[PDB]
Amino acid sequence: KEIELLELNKELIAQKVKTEKAQISDTVDSVPVTGIIGAQIALYKQQKDGFIRDAEQKALKIISDTWITRKTVDDGTPLPTGFDTAAVDAFTRKVAD
Amino acid sequence: KEIELLELNKELIAQKVKTEKAQISDTVDSVPVTGIIGAQIALYKQQKDGFIRDAEQKALKIISDTWITRKTVDDGTPLPTGFDTAAVDAFTRKVAD
Fold it and tell me: Which residues of chain B are within 8 Å of residue A22 when distances are taken between CB atoms?
């Protein structure tokens, strides 16, 4: 047994080595990390993919607020290309779901 | 076995050394850190890339509020170059997605 169990305690070490390699690298033994670690990496990337896009969105928010108040005061304010029917339809198709 | 297992327990030490080097430096053995540690570093940089840009955005928020109330009271307030149709179109194209 102690010998049979020792045979089945080198694997565990191999899995620990694989996890240690996946800690820094995203490709263990020429295989992408697809698991709990992979999900953590994906969510970490999204949190980066976010932020930047959230900051751009919140800047566009103040830009759109300025344009909206200009339109409310001045009825002659030109409509930008990102505010026509094509943009709204594109956004709705982007939502989809 | 104890010898075979000991052969597979020097690796783990090597991975620990690599992680320790990646803790301070961003380039282990002439290779960039691309993994969980790399994702942590990237998110730490974004949190810096943010802040600064968020502070600039919130200052521009009060600037735009002052301009908007000036326009609301005074209809003759000149429109800045960052408030015309070109700026709005550029912001919409920046959003894209």
Answer: 35-36
Q: Does B75 touch chain A (CB under 8 A)?
A: yes
In B1-97 the beta strands, taken as DSSP E runs, fall at: 27-28, 31-32
Give contacts of B47 with chain A, Cβ < 8 Å: 51
Structure-determination approach? cryo-EM
Contacts of A11 (CB under 8 A, 6+ apart): none
Which residues are CB-contacts of A7 (< 8 A; sequence separation ≥ 6)? Answer: B1
B46 with A41: Cβ contact below 8 A = no
Report residue A25 as tokens.
Answer: 């690298």
Chain A residues within an 8 Å CB radius of B1: 3, 6-7, 10
Residue A55: what are its φ and ψ, rounded to 5°?
-65, -40
Nearest chain B Cα to A94, which residue?
A: B97
Using CA atoms, how far apart are residues B37 and A26, in angstroms rounded to an integer? 10
- Tell me which H or E stretch contains A87: helix A85-95
Can you list the pairs that A13-20 forms with residues at least 24 positions away whose Cβ atoms lie under 8 Å? A13/B5, A13/B8, A13/B9, A13/B12, A14/B8, A16/B12, A17/B8, A17/B11, A17/B12, A17/B15, A20/B12, A20/B15, A20/B16, A20/B19
Structure tokens at B56: 């600039």
Q: Which neighbouring-strand residues pair with A22?
A: none
